[PDB]
């Protein structure tokens, strides 16, 4: 006989809107958070996880619409946030730079597409060289071919406080606690959760900079280690300080564009011009590849590891882009990588102001100067690695080639979100029994 | 929140209360925390869904007549060829979800069934009763 | 839709009608049909918390047991420390208004005792 | 499917608390419910009690004032104890795993694998 | 709840056995049934109202009506002997209802 049941502990895999639950307060007035508060839900106080007794499922890192879910609200948030300010539009014009190493920084005449009287005018500004072509001394800001550069709001901060992601009702959380989960196949220790840990949305490539970290040992993940051309997440289980700083004293100016609105340049530097100098322990950084290459090691039987160089043609992929205060340092790791292993560290830096976040077109973000100097500092927690691939050789010279290479940000992503599924509760069922 | 690790009979022996909390968390609770286009229409694109789903099940429950009911039996027999078990492997050796897996296939055959019957011949003969 | 002032025995005698007008719909008929960018996004939040609301008092009562009913004789025994007044005197020199403020600290106790005694009743 | 394995002090004092353990080599604690069953010498059997690992318990009303059960799932093992055992309480203590139906109003379960139970003495 | 039943039956070899209990409302609650061999834990006979678990021989079956039970066993073996017993559970209490246990001889 057929009896029908409500409330049966029933789940299946299910792809839903998650809601953003900021971490208590940063309701800040005088500059708004982004990341957080703007449209958040307050914190939850703190549930507790309900471990499901002998309850067994199948989780996987790849293939996780959670990132999908986070990759598509940081680009929404971004551009949303981006939109209402000023339009840089007027300034791409041509420019007479005659520099002030040698010309890291362009001193650029400019004329002033006027914004008021429709009569000319002039002025100056500084720039890094990294955001103008040299294209008969004619330069030209770079984005300026591809669509409108936009600056980005004073009252705005993009500052990264972790955002506790949360179920609608009706749907849940499945956390992976199982020890050493390499981010694919069944996991035991299985619990129910409400809402994930708060994930700090840092936006890097080539480095991890802040994070979680890895329980007892480095953990190297892949989808598939075979394949060379799948990223390895390698997870660190110590974390590896890093100090960035950018010792140029710099004075800000406003230059008029439009009515209404104003522009953000440096005017003057004052004193000498110094490199934008990132510091990491020359100890700390050996024994941390030390213990990747002997774990990547178990991965590849038998072989000497070797980590070589970044490779490619585009700062974006090829150099960690660290942000710093706002600012952003795209950074030398030839020194970190340039090694292998068979049984302080200066990197220099960049600063690049005009950037297409995300690695598209069609937009650009234009981040005005910080007043004076800069400094700031990090816990790496975990690098991205590529594999060289085959060779003539057959391997018999061995070398296996890591590269510390990415350049996909859903991997940044994807690295703190491994241990989550989305579910959706289905109450109703069916069972054969003996009545009416 | 529950368990699901355990037989259908033993994780069945609480639904009178297990139900009612997982009912509950569909309306009550959430709603007090949110008291506050990017995380905009999104929310109210969630409420909706939440509220759809809401009255699907409680939709589902009234045709067959379980008004009200966590644990309800009616007039349709079982299709022994369904699941052609005993009695005792279904409920004390599968689990919740394992069974749900394995007549999943059925799910319709078995709501057409439920309602033809529960309130539907059942109320012309109703119907029938209430002439006199 | 008035006697807020009065007292809770005669607010409550015929409860029934005064919540026939009061649940003829949250909306009445979709406003009584005479209703039928930014404008658009600030209605249809106001609508939808006015579906929620209607159907979390109707869960709400269906949890406690009481469907198609208004008032609900339930399992829980009165505990004097939420309040300790004579029977009499909440009923007959009480309003409404001031009963609901005088025990509004106990709602989500009582509330809770209620879906723990409605919910243990065999099923 | 399921052995059950019985232990306990046999001997214990009138106004001493009686403490028995049964492990089980069969199937998880978590899956199903646990009960306690007691037989005097000469006698029928007496329901005791039943636990489960989430928290749902009950007893015998001749016992309650007596009487706690709990389990540990680390060690797949359950246990019973019954404070100021007396002489009257000299039994055989059993152990079993309760199966169960659910029906809307008359619930029916079923102790099907025993332990052998172990018997309990109580005299000074 | 209590259960109501015969301290006792005795039949001759290659007979059938009626062993039986009742109470208030048998009909509306399952009545199952165990067999205890002395020195030995009670092993289920019939589980829900009438049926027979692997194990249990093709002699023993059950039946439920009004407010009485039986277990009835045909053929029955010297080894049969046994106290028989009913039980069912209080829903409305959690009340686990045993029967005293019929003594089942077989002469």
């Known amino acids: 006989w057929v009896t029908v049941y409500y409330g049966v502990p029933v789940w299946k895999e299910a792809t839903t809107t998650l809601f953003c639950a900021s971490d208590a307060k940063a309701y800040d007035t005088e500059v708004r958070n982004v990341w957080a508060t703007h449209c958040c839900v307050p914190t939850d106080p703190n549930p507790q996880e309900v471990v499901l007794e002998n309850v067994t499922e199948n989780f996987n890192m790849w293939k996780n619409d959670m990132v999908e879910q986070m990759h598509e609200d940081i680009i929404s948030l971004w551009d949303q946030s981006l939109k209402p300010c000023v339009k840089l539009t007027p300034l791409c014009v041509t420019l007479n730079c005659t520099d002030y190493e040698r010309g890291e920084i362009k001193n650029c005449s400019f004329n002033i597409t006027t914004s008021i009287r429709d009569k000319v005018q002039k002025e100056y500004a500084l720039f890094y060289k990294l955001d103008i072509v040299p294209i008969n001394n004619s330069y030209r800001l770079i984005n300026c071919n591809t669509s409108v550069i936009k600056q980005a709001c004073p009252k705005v901060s993009f500052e990264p406080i972790p955002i506790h992601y949360c179920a609608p009702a009706g749907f849940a959380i499945l956390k992976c606690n199982d020890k050493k989960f390499n981010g694919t196949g069944p996991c035991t220790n299985v619990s129910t959760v409400q809402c994930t840990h708060g994930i700090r949305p840092v936006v890097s490539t080539q480095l991890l900079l802040n994070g979680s970290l890895a329980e007892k040992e480095v953990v190297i993940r892949s989808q598939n280690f075979t394949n060379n051309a799948k990223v390895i997440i390698v997870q660190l289980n110590e974390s590896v300080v890093i100090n960035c700083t950018r010792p140029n004293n710099n004075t800000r100016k406003s230059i008029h564009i439009a009515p209404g609105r104003w522009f953000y340049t440096t005017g003057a530097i004052i004193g000498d011009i110094r490199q934008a100098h990132c510091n990491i322990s020359r100890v700390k950084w050996n024994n941390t590849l030390k213990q990747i290459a002997t774990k990547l090691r178990e991965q590849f039987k038998n072989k000497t590891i070797a980590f070589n160089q970044s490779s490619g043609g585009d700062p974006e992929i090829v150099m960690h882009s660290f942000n710093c205060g706002g600012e952003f340092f795209y950074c030398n790791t030839t020194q970190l990588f340039n090694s292998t292993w068979n049984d302080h560290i200066t990197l220099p830096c960049r600063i690049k102001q005009i950037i297409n976040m995300w690695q598209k077109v069609g937009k650009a973000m234009y981040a005005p100067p910080i007043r004076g100097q800069i400094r700031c500092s990090s816990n790496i927690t975990g690098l991205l690695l590529t594999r060289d691939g085959g060779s003539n050789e057959n391997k018999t010279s061995e070398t296996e080639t890591f590269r510390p290479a990415g350049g996909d940000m859903r991997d940044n992503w994807r690295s703190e979100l491994y241990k989550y599924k989305v579910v959706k509760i289905e109450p109703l069922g069916v069972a054969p029994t003996k009545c009416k | 929140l529950g368990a699901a690790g355990s037989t259908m009979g033993a994780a069945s022996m609480t639904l009178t209360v297990q139900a009612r909390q997982l009912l509950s968390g569909i309306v009550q609770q959430q709603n007090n925390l949110l008291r506050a286009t990017v995380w905009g229409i999104k929310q109210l694109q969630a409420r909706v869904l939440a509220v759809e789903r809401y009255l699907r099940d409680q939709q589902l429950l009234g045709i067959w007549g379980c008004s009200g009911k966590l644990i309800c039996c009616t007039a349709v027999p079982w299709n022994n060829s369904w699941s052609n078990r005993s009695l005792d492997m279904i409920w004390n050796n599968m689990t919740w979800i394992e069974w749900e897996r394995e007549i999943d296939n059925y799910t319709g055959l078995i709501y057409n069934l439920l309602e033809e019957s529960q309130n539907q011949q059942e109320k012309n003969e109703q119907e029938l009763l209430e002439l006199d | 839709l008035g006697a807020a002032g009065s007292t809770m025995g005669a607010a409550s005698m015929t409860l029934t009608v005064q919540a026939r007008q009061l649940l003829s719909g949250i909306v009445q008929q979709q406003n009584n049909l005479l209703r039928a960018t930014v404008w658009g996004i600030k209605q249809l939040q106001a609508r939808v918390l006015a579906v929620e609301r209607y159907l979390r008092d109707q869960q709400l009562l269906g949890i406690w047991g009481c469907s198609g009913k208004l008032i609900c004789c339930t399992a829980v025994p009165w505990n004097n420390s939420w309040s300790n007044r004579s029977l009499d005197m909440i009923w007959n020199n009480m309003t409404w208004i001031e009963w609901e403020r005088e025990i509004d600290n106990y709602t989500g106790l009582i509330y809770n005792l209620l879906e723990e005694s409605q919910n243990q009743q065999e099923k | 499917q399921v052995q059950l394995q019985e232990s306990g002090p046999g001997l214990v004092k009138p106004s001493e608390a009686l403490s028995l353990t049964c492990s089980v080599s069969g199937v998880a604690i978590s899956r199903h419910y646990w009960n306690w069953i007691r037989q005097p010498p000469g006698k029928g059997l007496e329901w005791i009690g039943y636990?489960?690992?989430?928290?749902?318990?009950n007893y015998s009303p001749s016992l309650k004032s007596r009487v706690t059960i709990s389990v540990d799932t680390s060690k797949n093992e359950f246990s019973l104890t019954l404070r100021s055992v007396t002489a009257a309480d000299t039994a055989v203590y059993y152990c079993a795993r309760e199966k169960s139906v659910v029906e809307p109003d008359n619930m029916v379960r079923w102790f099907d694998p025993w332990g052998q139970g172990t018997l309990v003495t109580v005299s000074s | 709840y209590e259960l109501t039943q015969p301290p006792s039956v005795s039949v001759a070899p290659g007979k059938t056995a009626r062993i039986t209990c009742g109470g208030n409302?048998?009909?509306?609650?399952?009545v199952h049934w165990y067999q205890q061999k002395p020195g030995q834990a009670p092993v289920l006979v019939i589980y829900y109202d009438s049926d027979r678990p692997s194990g249990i021989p093709e002699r023993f079956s059950g039946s439920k009506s009004g407010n009485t039970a039986t277990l009835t066993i045909s053929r029955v073996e010297a080894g049969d002997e046994a106290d028989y017993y009913c039980?069912?559970?209080?829903?409305?209490?959690?009340?686990?209802?045993f029967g005293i246990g019929t003594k089942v001889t077989v002469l």
């Open positions: 039980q069912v559970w209080d829903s409305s209490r959690d009340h686990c209802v």
């Open positions: 636990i489960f690992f989430n928290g749902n318990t």
């Open positions: 409302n048998i009909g509306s609650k399952s």
